[PDB]
Design a protein around this ligand. Structure first.
Ligand SMILES: CC(=O)N[C@@H]1[C@@H](O)[C@H](O)[C@@H](CO)O[C@H]1O
Length: 169
């Protein structure tokens, strides 16, 4: 079986977080992220993976992944995937992409399916040596059942918004 147990709207990163160092990529590791091991409860052989989609405009590229734009001065590299941040899939474009190939829980057991979203800031332009970014809608992640598993009457999609932050130049 499957049931939705998480939240529809999720914030990425600590609000008002500040990060210090073209394009220039800020090393923020996993600090600007959202992670929740338990978004769907699954059991008895349910098989599920994850699809992700970024709605921000693509303003460039870096090593194969899109630089998504927030402001004329700030962009973002974005990853979406299974719970642990190391499993993140680098996002490109604006279409649904497979960000977690999936797994099946046991026939006689139960567990949960989670997810993570992580971004790293990119300075596109310079300017009081500071860059502010308002709360911004990023995109979404939808569970992707397989092997005959069914979404049934369950919420399949959750959204993500980037919490406001400040970059120090
Ligand atoms: C740690 C936990 O409670 N549940 C994890 C879940 O977050 C993850 O999506 C899934 C597939 O890797 O594996 C479960 O064990």
């Amino acid at each position: 079986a499957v049931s939705f147990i998480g939240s529809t709207e999720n914030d990425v990163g600590p609000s008002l977080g500040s990060y210090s160092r073209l394009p220039f990529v800020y090393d923020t590791r996993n600090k600007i992220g959202y992670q929740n091991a338990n978004v769907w409860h699954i059991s008895k052989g349910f098989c599920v993976g994850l699809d992700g989609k970024v709605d921000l405009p693509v303003v460039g590229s870096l090593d194969g992944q899109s630089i998504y734009g927030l402001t004329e001065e700030v962009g973002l590299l974005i990853w979406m995937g299974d719970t642990k941040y190391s499993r993140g899939t680098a996002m490109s474009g604006n279409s649904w992409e497979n960000v977690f190939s999936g797994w099946c829980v046991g026939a006689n057991t139960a567990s949960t399916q989670g997810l993570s979203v992580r971004v790293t800031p990119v300075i596109l332009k310079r300017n009081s040596a500071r860059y502010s970014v308002q709360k911004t809608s990023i995109g979404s992640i939808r569970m992707r059942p397989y092997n005959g598993s069914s979404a049934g009457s369950v919420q399949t999609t959750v959204n993500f918004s980037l919490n406001p932050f400040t970059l120090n130049d």
